[PDB]
Write a protein that binds this DNA or RNA. Structure first.
Lengths: 325, 324
DNA sequence: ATACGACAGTTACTGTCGTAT
DNA sequence: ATACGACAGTAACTGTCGTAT
């Protein structure tokens, strides 16, 4: 028996899918006409592609099977359109990984409708998807190398240390052992991970990570660590000292201020004089100084001093560099 | 990667509903046309029910059945991707877009068999807590289901929409337009033509009320792609389109390389180490806000309207904060 | 038993180029 | 326009063989 490397994967997945009790490596090798070792490699491959694949030990041996795992109810165009423009927005940004997964969810999701449903909602969704676009922010393009990303998620799922060369941060070029905490998709993307004894989480730019390896050591994360909370410690990406920020939006821009997102923790309070008071705690003053720049003259930096300072040092730096003086 | 591209192709042809050209299979897998032929010849062996449909003067190929149910089950990774993309909008402020993906997620889990759903449910939950998307600060989008509902309905009926627009030059006038689409962004906008040969202009959804879908045909142009219109600006605002050209000093040069300024982009390393960035777009304020991010490391060489725009807003805030 | 590498040695995929019905 | 070889040159696949659970 046989058929070429590319199609043997479907052929083996189909086999483990239609087996009740599972097949052993020597059963696969005989059904694939390939022989023990590369059937192992093929079993490898389809487990990668079908994480639903389970193995059952009836010792001494071991049998592998893909259980059913599916039973459809034909969602709406706007649901589908939502999914597509979602994925469209992501590949438009350069987030090829997040986009890929969503395009794959779409393909399998479409295929699972009937002859009728598929061609019937088709022009519906593309009508919608053309009548919707997400504006793309200017900024850095995220590194989404599903090799490095797959390695992170692998280590995280396993409770295992991740290892990589990092070209950044005070001593480039060299191999680093971390406890991976999570992935922070932002301007670029970041590994959130503890390095070394008694560390506290640091941000590792995916742009700068080569040569990942999922080590065989346990690296559990602190039981008290929350990726969200870690992200919410800063106004943007940078984790400075966490400041108490106090801003006063002029009345001219109060309507905006009252329907605006400054931080996850914001309290906005309207004032009798029509101005609006904004308080929140966060690091990332520079990143904050930038956004305040888009408020023009309608914002007063009440607190903290260090914000006031960086706002002005930033201002005068561009001001001479473009001739505002 | 490359062991599953045959299977990635077979999924694409089972969902395409009318097929791909032999050459757009090559573009959605980055393969080169000849390679794709062999992929097609091998998908056909795995999926003999694949139809070949003439669409002159090329062919389409589609799997009309759907795959085996084992190539259809979505993974925890894809499920988690939907959620991270849902929770990203929920957090943004964009609760109408978000609840269609949660609706989709819901109908995906429900379609799993019981014992399968309970086994993947924790794998995704763990997946969604190891990943989060930074929410940038900015306006909380206005997504009134009834305002969006009205707009889409009109676009589906190719009908005129009339609303009262509290903004612009005579606020309160109820206006009748041809709705072309929606630009989701800082706040959200209706892009729409108004009357005889009008040029497309943007309408804030939060400045709309009294939305009626009238039964007057409102056909759009079909040269018009909403995407083209969106990309006419650097951000949201559509003033006169400028040929913007900047040099990123060689200090911040590696960032300039892996940076997105515009869709009409071109960045090339100059000789002295600088990087030259060129793109074509209106919206000079939003652009000058972004150039503030670079501080001293960017010089504006054209246009002067962007320099005057930068110095205006640079001087506006410098006085406001005590800089000079 | 399976998990899994290191590693000669065959071959398969890639793409370019024609010749077809 | 494809459906297809053919054919060098590139790249992985394969199977044998270790060593570890």
């Amino acid at each position: 028996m046989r058929h070429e490397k590319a199609t043997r994967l479907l052929d083996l997945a189909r086999m483990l899918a239609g087996s009740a009790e599972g097949l052993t490596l020597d059963e696969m090798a005989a059904a694939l006409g390939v022989g023990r070792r590369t059937a192992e490699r093929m079993r490898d491959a389809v487990w990668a592609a079908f994480p639903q694949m389970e193995a059952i030990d009836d010792p001494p041996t071991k049998r592998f099977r893909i259980p059913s795992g599916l039973d459809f109810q034909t969602p709406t165009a706007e649901e589908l359109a939502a999914l597509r423009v979602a994925a469209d927005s992501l590949r438009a940004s350069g987030a090829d990984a997040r986009a890929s997964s969503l395009y794959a969810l779409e393909a399998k999701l479409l295929s699972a409708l009937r002859g009728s449903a598929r061609r019937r909602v088709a022009p519906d969704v593309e009508a919608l998807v053309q009548a919707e676009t997400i504006a793309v922010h200017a900024g850095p393009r995220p590194y989404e190398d599903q090799a490095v990303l797959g390695a992170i998620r692998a280590a995280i799922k396993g409770l295992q240390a991740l290892s990589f060369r990092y070209e950044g941060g005070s001593t480039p070029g060299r191999t680093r052992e971390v406890t991976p905490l999570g992935v922070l998709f932002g301007r670029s993307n970041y590994l959130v991970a503890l390095e070394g004894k008694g560390g506290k989480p640091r941000s590792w730019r995916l742009d700068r990570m080569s040569d990942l390896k999922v080590l065989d050591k346990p690296a559990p994360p602190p039981q008290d660590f929350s990726l969200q909370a870690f992200a919410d410690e800063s106004f943007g990406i940078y984790h400075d000292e966490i400041q108490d920020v106090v801003l006063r939006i002029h009345k001219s821009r109060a309507e905006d201020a009252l329907r605006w997102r400054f931080h996850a923790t914001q309290q906005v309070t309207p004032e009798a004089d029509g101005s609006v008071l904004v308080t929140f705690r966060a690091g990332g003053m520079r990143e904050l100084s930038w956004h305040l720049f888009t408020w023009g003259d309608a914002v007063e930096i009440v607190a903290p001093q260090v914000l006031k300072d960086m706002m002005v040092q930033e201002l005068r730096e561009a001001g001479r560099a473009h001739g505002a003086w």
